[PDB]
Design a protein around this ligand. Structure first.
Ligand SMILES: COc1ccc(CC[C@@]2(C)NC(=O)NC2=O)cc1
Ligand SMILES: COc1ccc(CC[C@@]2(C)NC(=O)NC2=O)cc1
Length: 435
């Protein structure tokens, strides 16, 4: 695997030991061969788990998620996917890693897609080796891969709203269930219905995952209600998955606004990862997977793949060359390569709007490419009337940095800035100049 020009897809089934067995073997061989190596974790939770798998191997953990005292002589670095792409974008020296290992390499966040594009292009140039670890490589068509233990698969209607009758199978179960929902708001309603029925429910989503996942270890629970973030190596001691088989799809409309379309079917890869939360223990056959819909190719035209092109167009590779998306997922976007390349000063603004601003890539790009500076928030208020953001069915309002109460009406409307209470609270703080 470790030879230049090699990209290996390590596509062992979910729970086959890619992280806990195979990775430490790859790392030992890399150190022996004096290959400067990066290991890419999708989350801080997985970074901390990798430290346990790799303990007493000389690895530099480029994350505050791990309390380790480094020797200073390690030639293996571990960081999050997003950290890797972040550091490529910034005026930060990133070594030209001889071996590039991505764990949970199906992750469809823009920074993960961009990282795959950058790494696979370095491999194609003959500069590096790479290993992509995932049970569900791009374009996988198999929602029902092998497992450590037999799974009971059942197609069933799954509630997506509070219910009073007709779903007794949901609450009659005495074990632990992981339930994949398409959105935070959707999960909140199902969680409230379960709580009212006497169940103990933990909710996970991208903003809370890194701190709420610990509750799955520290608290007794009956249900985890999770978005798609638990497709990325989240391990539960569960005996059932309930899968809506639904997601939201960010869609760029007329190159002018982003909507959250759907809910609509998940990809086969997503369905396989959701189901793959169970069937992991060969001593516990007959974990259940209850699924409420079919799969479809909903990654086609999904905003994350366009956003990954916006990132890759702004990463230096060699002279004016631009990294390509990883070939198996390159047709999910119709973009002109280089169309999003920014001049130095607009690139810095773009980066800051994503890092400190915490804005979606697409929205950071619209602001930066308009020649607006990071602290200039006038664009949050001068949009068209149809871009008015609502809070409890009346326009959302903030006090501007000038002390003026104004309706939130951004010039570019990205539905991800207000898809739930927490998102809108963060965007209100941004519009107010508070970060
Ligand atoms: C042991 O070596 C290192 C440890 C930590 C870091 C940076 C960690 C960090 C969190 N903070 C931000 O500046 N970048 C990152 O994600 C770099 C090297
Ligand atoms: C998949 O990429 C994304 C990147 C950023 C965001 C917005 C996060 C946030 C905190 N910042 C705020 O202004 N609204 C908010 O929830 C959503 C998705």
């Amino acid at each position: 695997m470790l030879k230049k020009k090699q990209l290996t897809v390590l596509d062992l089934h979910p729970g086959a030991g890619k992280t806990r067995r195979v990775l430490p073997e790859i790392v030992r061989e890399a150190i022996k061969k004096r290959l400067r190596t990066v290991i890419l974790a999708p989350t801080r939770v997985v970074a901390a788990e990798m430290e346990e798998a790799l303990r007493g191997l000389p690895v530099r953990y480029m994350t505050t998620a791990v309390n380790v005292t480094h020797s200073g002589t390690e030639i293996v670095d571990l960081m999050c996917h997003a950290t890797f792409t972040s550091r490529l974008l910034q005026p930060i020296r990133v070594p030209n890693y001889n071996l590039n290992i991505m764990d949970e390499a199906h992750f469809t966040d823009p920074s993960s897609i961009a990282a795959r594009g950058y790494i696979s292009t370095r491999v194609e140039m003959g500069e590096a080796a790479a290993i992509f670890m995932t049970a569900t490589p791009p374009g996988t068509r198999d929602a029902f891969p092998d497992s450590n233990s037999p799974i009971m698969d059942t197609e069933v209607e799954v509630p997506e709203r509070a219910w009073s009758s007709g779903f007794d199978w949901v609450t009659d179960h005495s074990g632990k269930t992981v339930w994949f929902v398409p959105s935070v708001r959707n999960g909140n309603e199902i969680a409230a219905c379960l709580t009212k029925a006497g169940k103990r429910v933990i909710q996970l989503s991208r903003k809370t995952f890194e701190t709420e996942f610990q509750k799955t270890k520290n608290q007794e629970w009956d249900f985890v209600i999770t978005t798609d973030i638990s497709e990325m190596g989240a391990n539960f001691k569960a005996d059932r998955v309930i899968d809506s088989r639904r997601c939201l799809k960010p869609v760029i409309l007329d190159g002018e606004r982003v909507i959250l379309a759907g809910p609509m079917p998940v990809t086969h890869a997503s369905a396989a990862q959701r189901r793959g939360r169970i069937g992991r223990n060969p001593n516990k056959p007959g974990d259940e997977y209850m699924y409420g819909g079919g799969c479809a190719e909903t990654d086609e035209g999904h905003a994350h793949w366009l956003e990954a092109r916006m990132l890759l167009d702004n990463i230096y590779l060699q002279d004016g060359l631009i990294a390509s998306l990883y070939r198996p997922e390159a047709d999910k976007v119709a973009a002109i390569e280089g169309e999003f390349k920014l001049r130095t000063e607009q690139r810095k603004t773009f980066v800051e709007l994503m890092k400190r601003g915490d804005l979606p890539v697409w929205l950071a790009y619209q602001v930066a490419s308009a020649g607006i500076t990071y602290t200039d928030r006038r664009w949050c208020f001068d949009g068209t009337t149809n871009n008015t953001i609502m809070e409890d069915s009346v326009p959302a309002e903030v006090w501007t940095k000038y002390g003026e109460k104004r309706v939130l009406k951004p010039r570019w409307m990205d539905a991800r800035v207000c898809s739930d209470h927490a998102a809108l609270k963060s965007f209100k703080e941004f519009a107010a100049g508070k970060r």
